[PDB]
Amino acid sequence: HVNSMEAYRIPVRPQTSSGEQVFGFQLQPGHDSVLKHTLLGEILNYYANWSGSMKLTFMYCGAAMATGKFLIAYSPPGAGVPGSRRDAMLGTHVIWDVGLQSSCVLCVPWISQTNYRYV
């Protein structure tokens, strides 16, 4: 899908049971091959250290009559990675309705032991 326009096209659909995952990636800008070739990623790669809070913005490009909610969650490194909606509710999260707003902003907070992180 990276050779077409379908790389930017995160799909959702009516479910059968709730709590399922939509997408998921690691928070490694400059190294993880999802947000490496974005505009933030091509600037960190001229550098060897980064620090600060990132901002993720969404935009539901669906019909005007559909309604639903999502659970967008950031999880600190620790151990390990969450594998359920019950597990990825204890970390930092927001709840985003698509019948009320079309765009949601998730400020990913800076939690680390060091002052900088390696790119």
Added chain:
Amino acid sequence: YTNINYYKDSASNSLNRRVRSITLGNSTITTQECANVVVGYGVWPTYLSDHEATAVDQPTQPDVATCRFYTLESVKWESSSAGWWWKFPEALSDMGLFGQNMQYHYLGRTGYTIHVQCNASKFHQGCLLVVCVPEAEMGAATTDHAFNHTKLSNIGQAMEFSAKKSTDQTGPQTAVHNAGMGVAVGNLTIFPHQWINLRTNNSATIVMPYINSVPMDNMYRHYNFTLMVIPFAKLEHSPQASTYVPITVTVAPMCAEYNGLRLAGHQ
């Protein structure tokens, strides 16, 4: 009306004649479309004062680790679906550092905020009743027979009502028009409640204080209040519409205190 008092006691006397979000911890729900927030019996959840607090040990108030939004399970709304009930704090007994503080502490006082969310389309129709009932002593299904503590409330599982009556030998009477208490289900609008009309409402937010006769009570043998979601108008749509309409409950403890630190319960 001479109003003289012959005796020395008081008990010997006569008669007396959009964008509005809530950011609790590292957690944010969104939103109410400038609609409404029902709060308790007009009382916001607060801490313990010094006229109260018969205990002498110092209270434990974590304020971030335990007082964030805990998203419970998701249940399925159908046409032939009677209702559900969650008994608190049994429904939050295993979630995060809130359920971990309950095991190490004898007493516990807390208020909650309940956010029941269920979205639909403009072509769906139906109406829910979200009511928070304090001290709902339920009646057994088979009378003159004791009934089990896992039929009243499992740990966070949504116990459901029934359209007919229940002939169980070890559970509660789950006839939904009697609401499990032998009372008319239309008269449960005394307790703090809010409707979810699927054409205008989309959510319900109730904020309940700590309602109990004692200032601090053990939270492993006493159900403080139950939360009942009963549909009065049933869910109806065309067969071409989306048939799976779920109901998610998101609840958060507010101003939680604990006392009596000992080893882990709950024997």
Added chain:
Amino acid sequence: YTNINYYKDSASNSLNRRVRSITLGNSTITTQECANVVVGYGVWPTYLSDHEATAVDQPTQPDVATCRFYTLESVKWESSSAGWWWKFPEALSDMGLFGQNMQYHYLGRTGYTIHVQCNASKFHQGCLLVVCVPEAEMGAATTDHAFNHTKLSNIGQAMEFSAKKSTDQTGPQTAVHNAGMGVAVGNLTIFPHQWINLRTNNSATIVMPYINSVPMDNMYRHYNFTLMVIPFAKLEHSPQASTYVPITVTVAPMCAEYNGLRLAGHQ
């Protein structure tokens, strides 16, 4: 000494030329006979300031539930007994609501107070050295071979030294005169230490602050400091005296903060 600066950078410059008890929580140790309390590098354990705290999440400070006296195990002092070491906070990783906050939180900053108690009679003789060593990177027994994380510190178990050297294939070099770091054991009197002379002392109380290069660090992959109890003069008595002389360690976290609330570790 003209002291002119040609370049614009700072790193391009030249060189620069009884009854005294402690009541922590619902817990009381007793006593020091007006003897002494050794505190750290002269620094009392405090909280995090705002020049520090690179994290943006709000800290969790329980102050009663986690900051009381936690009594560890009891070890047996013999004549042919070399020493012991406990690595912190691995030794407190399972005790109470302190070890429960570690599983749900990414970062963690804490200081401690160590109370090593060992009583005897007037007819016993011996001398212990109770030393708190920060960042004790230990050397492996079999060189050029990696060694296991359960040989450095089990969960609260007192790992012991040896009189001879260690020929293990997966553990640390436990020669007690090299103190596991390749250093002369007589020179470990830089670190915060206190002697237990069995004719006059009977106890030792060390209060250590948080000593680390970063303001807050993960406490499940980094041993902040180790606590070594090494007898320099061996225990000797008559064969008619009481032969079992135990050593109990009682430790308590002081000013514990946590950040980064997520699900339970520690994968």
